[PDB]
């Protein structure tokens, strides 16, 4: 089975008056709380040169999150600064693809905060709302180059569960105290000469069904386009995959997913479900933002 | 197996000190072979080149234009006295490098690095265009990143424009629906270790269509930096999917304006033809003459 | 036009046994030889996790390999034994004794592996002792006092000279000898390949394998993920030092869980494989936890 | 028609001596002036192995060059002394001091060596003392303030200037002066040849020799697989820039054991040359760990 976009232009795009989204906003969290689709976007100051030895400043961008409240879920309303912002100089080059999850009564953010001073410098991030609002508690998830982080909603056997992407593999592991991990094991890797080749990642946080957890990732073949995929993690155990579609659900079709600042991507962060209805905000090209729908009985293995 | 062979153990082009672009180093230039005519559009610098400082110093400050010859035998240019082409101040204010031409139906690109000169990551490929190769125009960055060894290909492939670039240090291909925006980004050759071709290659000039492929000549830089020629071969309907690739150098510095100059140990082209079943390779040497050397179209199998 | 090894079993043949110390938690990367109708593991073991993002190996985490031995008639069903047949000399191997490599020579076997001595990430070499019973090792010598590893000698001489595979970062070179303890004519004979499985570095597996078209040249690639898969190629006959023939995709990956998940995750790696009835048996360590194998009809080998 | 030097001796003519720490473990790459009916011999001396295959030089494996001195009246008997004649000093040449070559020019002694701060493994260049003497050596000096070795001063001056040979990679190098200070109109001399014995680079030997049919130019060249061999050229005696000469094949290779096998395998390597009754002695490092010497007589010198 397929997605299929809402809208075959973009939902959102970058604003060149405010510096910080000037160039682009892509790689979304999203919850669905207030019967609206709440909408956290990563956000550029500048395009993206990547091919460099090392990060420079003469090509520095900076992240930012930014937020975007909307009712039915394809026309949204923004602000004029961005939600999140790096404050320690770990976050330098700023906070990129958030995750959200809600555990208990409370919201977390995971994202990847990046320092710039090479191209490993980079590390897990996490930050915590009970509103969505007042984002405190900063800490730095693992310390180690790793990214592609969500939260799992439930907690498993009374650990909370940490998605991440070890390269090239997706990672869970477990926590008593959402501070230390362990028990990280690899779930899912990427399979060879294929669209999903080089590396995989988890899209936004396993959305929870009633045959097991909703695994949205990504895959990128070794061109570097990345694509969505979809897996099923057993819902008693999410560590076992108990299935996953061959094929695509989500490619750079559309011309502002083949082209943009880094072309032939197509990246979610954040899925809702609404309606019966799966929403998958993806970046695209990271430049714009789409959205795209499944029928919830369409999915099937 | 095969090498090519110089016209001449002499330079055909050399600097001419009488005029201050042009005055120590004309090389890397793009060839045109039009209407029995050779083109030449060649990369011409003011100054000897140091490049051994943590950033590019005013006094140390060179110079790249683009000059232009024609000639009817390959061998015997006429030269003018102004360059065709310079750089615009601040992008392009070190100037214009290593152009590679391309026509491509019945228009004519010349994409280039620009060279600011603000840090060594201060270039760019940049493109313009002209009917006519006298009037050039439109100039645009062809990819805002710091890349060189660019060339186009002299036709689309699926209705798409066919970019060769040079993300270190691989030769990548690229598409186009329209000459601005590139996509499908693919890596098609790789420096080898423990090569003459093991710390980088790029394209030399763009790619000579054939019967059998398309004809790939490009430079590969030991660990040394020299700077030698190689061929691969490309498939004729997918450029991305090399065919075949000689394992030897096609061309290396070997006469003394090639090994000793302004950079030692350099041949390098932006430019080969075919003319009467010959290609004609044209390369800088010592990043300070240009040369010509040939091969008999008969003589490339691989 | 490519070839594959298949697993005998989708369970590994020898793991961890917890009741003894020096192997409770890890056994793999096990030399292989085949003789009097038995197949001979050596067995790399070790009696903790590993722990290897420290600047330094430290006390707190020191791990010890051993080596240690099973026999087996059928190859998928072995005979262990309470202690290890190989340990590490104090202090220059107080990390242990890994990855052997099992060569005959004349009617008398070497086994080579690498000491660790755990005083720094670089405190190891090659080292080798020998007997000529399989039992009684002997003759402890550091054949290149260097950091190196992933050796293994050639079954026989060629033009009278001993031949050694070693591991240079990042290649797989190859030297010579008169007396099996100075090595000279050292020589690169295979390099990683950019952009593929192959392409951090690049070593032996198992000591390369006899045939009639050449020398068969199991190696493991390394990927910069840090994956360790296995490759093939073909060495010349009467020249090892030149390459023949390279299969360019892998003929072993980590698929299954104890391959993909253990102590060091994304591994397999042999260092002993063996021909019985037209059959190559190749061990391979899995996640450095556990012993798998994996077989090749020999006609299926091709080039 | 080839020519090459034939040994003296099966027997090194200077040895390691494992009771003096500076030379406890390497003698090699030495110069050697003859002064006053003598051999005068300087020579590079380690007090370690050599490991060179770490990606960066460590300080666990560092080796420290320094230069000692020793006399003879027959070229084959060497005395020799207690302690070193030239070390590196702290840090620039924290590693020691290199493959001296010692030119006499107009009645003063030249020693240009490679100093090496093993802070990176390009932290070398090239640095020059003097002497009266052969003695009490002073005014040292970078050379050159780059990554270079294999470094000699012609004996005359050419048009009123200093001559300098150099290897910038991985040729052969000439340069000027006028003061010994600056060096200027740097130009590439000789080049390596792909696919000979001499393709992975080339460096000077000894200082040149004066001939009357113009300089003899013994060199070093360096194959794929790193063998060091000596060569030998022949430049123009007014312009010494020029090489009107090169033999195709070379005048010395690793051949017995102690050249063969060693610290560093498979070199010969000289850093000095005298003429004495009419006839080239040739000292040559072997194996980076002994000093051999070879002659020829200086009739058979043909091109
Ligand atoms: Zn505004
Ligand atoms: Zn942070
Ligand atoms: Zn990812
Ligand atoms: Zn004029
Ligand atoms: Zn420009
Ligand atoms: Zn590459
Ligand atoms: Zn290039
Ligand atoms: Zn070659
Ligand atoms: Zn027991
Ligand atoms: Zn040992
Ligand atoms: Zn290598
Ligand atoms: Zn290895
Ligand atoms: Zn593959
Ligand atoms: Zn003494
Ligand atoms: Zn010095
Ligand atoms: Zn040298």
Same mark, same amino acid.
């Given at each position: @089975?397929?997605?299929?976009?809402?809208?075959?232009?973009?939902?959102?795009?970058?604003?060149?008056?405010?510096?910080?989204?000037?160039?682009?906003? @892509?790689?979304?969290?999203?919850?669905?709380?207030?019967?609206? @689709?709440?909408?956290?976007?990563?956000?550029?100051?500048?395009?993206? #040169?990547?091919?460099?030895?090392?990060?420079? !400043?003469? /090509?520095?961008?900076?992240?930012?999150?930014? /937020? *975007?409240?909307? =009712?039915?879920?394809?026309?949204?309303?923004?602000?004029?600064?961005? +939600?999140? $912002?790096?404050?320690?100089?770990? !976050?330098?080059?700023?906070?990129?693809?958030?995750?959200?999850?809600?555990?208990? &009564?409370?919201?977390?953010?995971?994202?990847?905060?990046?320092?710039?001073?090479? %191209?490993?410098?980079?590390?897990?991030?996490? +930050? %915590?709302?009970?509103?969505?609002?007042? %984002?405190?508690?900063?800490?730095?998830?693992?310390?180690?180059?790793?990214?592609?982080?969500?939260?799992?909603?439930?907690?498993?056997?009374?650990?909370?569960?940490?998605?991440?992407?070890?390269?090239?593999?997706?990672?869970?592991? /477990?926590?008593?105290?959402?501070?230390?991990?362990?028990?990280?094991?690899?779930?899912?890797?990427?399979?060879?000469?294929?669209? =999903?080749?080089?590396?995989?990642?988890?899209?936004?946080?396993?959305?929870?069904?009633?045959?097991?957890?909703?695994?949205?990732?990504?895959?990128?073949?070794?061109? &570097?386009?990345?694509?969505?995929?979809?897996?099923?993690?057993?819902?008693?155990?999410?560590?076992? +995959?108990? *299935?996953?579609?061959? =094929?695509?659900?989500?490619?750079?079709?559309?011309? %502002? !997913?083949?082209?943009?600042?880094?072309?032939? $991507? #197509?990246?979610?962060?954040?899925? +809702?479900?609404?309606?019966?209805? /799966?929403?998958?905000?993806?970046?695209?090209?990271?430049?714009?933002?789409?959205?795209? #729908?499944?029928?919830?009985?369409?999915?099937? @293995?």
């Amino acid at each position: @089975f397929r997605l299929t976009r809402l809208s075959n232009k973009p939902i959102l795009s970058p604003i060149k008056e405010h510096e910080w989204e000037k160039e682009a906003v @892509f790689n979304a969290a999203v919850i669905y709380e207030g019967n609206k @689709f709440h909408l956290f976007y990563r956000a550029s100051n500048n395009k993206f #040169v990547l091919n460099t030895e090392k990060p420079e !400043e003469k /090509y520095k961008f900076v992240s930012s999150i930014g /937020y *975007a409240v909307s =009712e039915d879920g394809i026309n949204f309303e923004r602000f004029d600064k961005p +939600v999140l $912002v790096g404050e320690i100089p770990q !976050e330098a080059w700023g906070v990129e693809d958030p995750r959200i999850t809600k555990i208990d &009564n409370k919201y977390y953010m995971l994202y990847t905060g990046f320092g710039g001073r090479d %191209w490993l410098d980079f590390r897990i991030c996490m +930050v %915590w709302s009970d509103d969505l609002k007042n %984002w405190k508690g900063h800490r730095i998830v693992l310390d180690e180059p790793n990214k592609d982080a969500a939260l799992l909603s439930e907690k498993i056997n009374g650990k909370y569960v940490l998605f991440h992407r070890r390269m090239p593999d997706i990672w869970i592991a /477990y926590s008593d105290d959402l501070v230390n991990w362990y028990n990280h094991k690899i779930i899912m890797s990427p399979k060879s000469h294929t669209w =999903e080749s080089k590396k995989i990642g988890i899209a936004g946080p396993p959305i929870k069904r009633e045959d097991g957890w909703l695994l949205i990732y990504h895959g990128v073949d070794n061109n &570097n386009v990345y694509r969505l995929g979809v897996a099923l993690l057993d819902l008693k155990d999410p560590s076992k +995959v108990i *299935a996953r579609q061959k =094929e695509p659900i989500l490619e750079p079709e559309l011309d %502002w !997913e083949i082209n943009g600042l880094v072309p032939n $991507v #197509v990246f979610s962060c954040g899925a +809702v479900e609404v309606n019966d209805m /799966y929403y998958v905000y993806y970046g695209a090209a990271d430049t714009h933002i789409g959205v795209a #729908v499944i029928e919830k009985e369409k999915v099937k @293995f």
